[PDB]
């Protein structure tokens, strides 16, 4: 909970970064300039980090509150508060 005996800084590795992230960005497009929504797998796509709103699937299939830990197959996103968007990362793949 709040027990931190020590803190050590280790040098990461490719497999480590693979492990941390939940996606692989592929397009530089930002939020859409017309509909003000993320583009498919863009720099903000909900499929990577999380839903823009809280307890809200992209497609509206499971927009009900009583859903936690359920990934929507129609849109392939998770249902949790907007805070989770603040604590998930993405890794780019280098050629």
């Amino acid at each position: 909970v709040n027990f931190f005996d020590e803190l050590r800084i280790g040098l990461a590795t490719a497999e480590d970064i693979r492990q941390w992230s939940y996606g692989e960005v592929k397009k530089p497009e930002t939020i859409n300039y017309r509909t003000l929504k993320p583009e498919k797998d863009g720099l903000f796509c909900e499929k990577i980090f999380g839903p823009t709103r809280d307890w809200e699937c992209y497609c509206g299939k499971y927009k009900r509150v009583r859903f936690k830990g359920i990934i929507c197959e129609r849109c392939g996103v998770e249902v949790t508060r907007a805070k989770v968007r603040r604590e998930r990362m993405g890794h780019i793949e280098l050629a």
Binding site: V25, K26, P28, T30, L43, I92, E93, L94, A95
Partner: protein, 98 residues
């Protein structure tokens, strides 16, 4: 991030299409330059400047400097259950009273 992703995709497409060593090597050099810039701008060479020839704030700039996240955690925070007002001397109070 736009620059890095865009250049990586150009590399991938170019290697798929096929081309001599000179272009591929030049393109790899450009990618290395972009990554070095992203992890730090102005570390070496001309820093990238888009607006008004203003150096951009790289990822590493979040830690150093006055606005570096390390320093800002010590300058204090705004707390709740507070209040400020003027003070007037009162001779009718005990020492442990206000």
């Amino acid at each position: 991030y736009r620059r890095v992703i865009n250049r990586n995709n150009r590399l991938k497409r170019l290697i798929d299409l096929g081309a001599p060593e000179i272009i591929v090597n030049n393109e790899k050099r450009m990618l290395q330059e972009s990554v070095d810039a992203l992890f730090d701008n102005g570390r070496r060479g001309r820093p990238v400047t888009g607006p008004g020839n203003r150096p951009l704030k790289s990822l590493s700039d979040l830690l150093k400097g006055k606005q570096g996240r390390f320093r800002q955690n010590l300058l204090g925070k705004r707390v709740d259950y507070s209040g400020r007002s003027v003070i007037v001397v009162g001779p009718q109070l005990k020492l442990h009273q206000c």
